[PDB]
Design a protein around this ligand. Structure first.
Ligand SMILES: NC(=O)C1=CN([C@@H]2O[C@H](COP(=O)(O)OP(=O)(O)OC[C@H]3O[C@@H](n4cnc5c(N)ncnc54)[C@H](OP(=O)(O)O)[C@@H]3O)[C@@H](O)[C@H]2O)C=CC1
Ligand SMILES: O=C(O)COc1cc(F)ccc1C(=S)NCc1ccc(Br)cc1F
Length: 316
């Protein structure tokens, strides 16, 4: 397959990136070094993941080593919910830049549509356990993102975990200056997202699929939960193609014209997950994988469900 997708800001984005949520800080520097050595050119980061400094050590070493040029990397980070304040967005972006050892990001996303009360805590709670909102809305936060483009800190801006009506709100913003380039959402065979994906694609937004393996290391996993990697129907498609189940799960979103960001800290898996450019799933394989949808989400959070902008009350 072509390795990059054209964004609506005119830049090209690698369709396969390395995820970094849950990558331990004592392992992620090596993971990113290995990833760059075996061909990855896109790293998905976030301030809330608490490991950007260590990701940055790897990026900087590989730039210094001249393994890669900065222009050939596509580095993504995300604005956390406690920084949806006009006066806090720039500093949040600059902290991420300083940690990652960069003078610009290729793409900066609003991590979740919901703003939370600023402060040290990433999830400020009231005494009954509900998150404490911010009064600032997705339109004013978007304007703040647009300023980052105009100041040279980021090349593209986008959104993450925005539902259909939230994307529409952004697109219908009075005075909109830059459209979102990307909406990064959970997507895999058990949460296939056809509705939201068609809406976004019809508007020229590129969709990035997160948790493409079903996030088996999510901290709230339960025994018994469905498991993509162990689903014998997916295993059978993989065997037919002489590939691993993970490789099928990565190739699947690629053939939907999505970007995909599997996470690993295991060097052999980092390499395995990149070897997805030399086979094709058939249309029948694709439709069969889509048939496994069950509307199952890795990423949801009860403490945030009353926030007025919590995204998963809407159907899509
Ligand atoms: N925007 C948002 O709100 C969100 C963004 N994301 C982004 O998406 C990335 C990917 O999603 P994530 O939730 O981390 O989960 P993934 O679906 O990428 O699954 C990661 C898990 O799969 C394991 N794994 C990786 N490759 C293989 C393989 N070849 N065989 C078997 N097991 C494998 C990893 O193990 P190991 O590491 O031990 O090798 C890890 O336990 C995140 O890291 C983050 O960058 C994710 C959630 C939300
Ligand atoms: O969020 C990630 O990238 C990966 O997940 C996380 C990553 C972190 F470093 C810390 C918390 C989360 C959680 S608990 N995320 C879910 C979540 C957060 C906020 C809102 Br609004 C809803 C929601 F569902």
């Amino acid at each position: 397959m072509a390795s990059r997708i054209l964004l609506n800001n005119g830049a090209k984005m690698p369709i396969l990136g390395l995820g970094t949520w849950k990558s331990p800080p004592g392992q992620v520097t090596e993971a990113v070094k290995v990833a760059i050595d075996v061909g990855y050119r896109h790293i998905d980061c976030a301030h809330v993941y608490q490991n950007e400094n260590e990701v940055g050590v790897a990026i900087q070493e590989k730039l210094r080593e001249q393994v890669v040029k900065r222009e050939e990397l596509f580095i993504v980070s995300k604005l956390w919910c406690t920084y949806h304040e006009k006066g806090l967005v720039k500093g949040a972006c600059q902290k991420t830049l300083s940690d990652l050892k960069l003078d610009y990001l290729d793409l900066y996303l609003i991590h979740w549509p919901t703003g939370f009360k600023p402060g040290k805590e990433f999830f400020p709670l009231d005494e009954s356990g509900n998150v404490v909102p911010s009064d600032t809305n997705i339109l004013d936060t978007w304007a703040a993102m647009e300023e980052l483009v105009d100041e040279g800190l980021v090349k593209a801006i986008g959104i993450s975990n925005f539902n259909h009506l939230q994307v529409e709100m952004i697109l219908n913003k009075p005075g909109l200056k830059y459209k979102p380039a990307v909406n990064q959402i959970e997507c895999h065979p058990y949460l296939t997202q056809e509705k939201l994906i068609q809406y976004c694609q019809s508007k020229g937004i590129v969709v990035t699929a997160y948790s493409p393996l079903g996030s088996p290391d999510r901290p709230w996993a339960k025994p018994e939960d469905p498991s993509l990697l162990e689903d014998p129907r997916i295993k059978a498609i993989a065997a037919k193609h002489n590939k691993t189940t993970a490789q099928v799960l990565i190739r699947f979103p690629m053939q939907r014209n999505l970007v995909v960001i599997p996470k690993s800290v295991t060097p052999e898996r980092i390499a395995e997950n990149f070897k997805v450019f030399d086979f094709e799933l058939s249309s029948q394989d694709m439709t069969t994988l889509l048939s496994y949808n069950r509307n199952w989400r890795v990423c949801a959070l009860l403490s945030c469900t009353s926030h007025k902008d919590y995204p998963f009350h809407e159907e899509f």
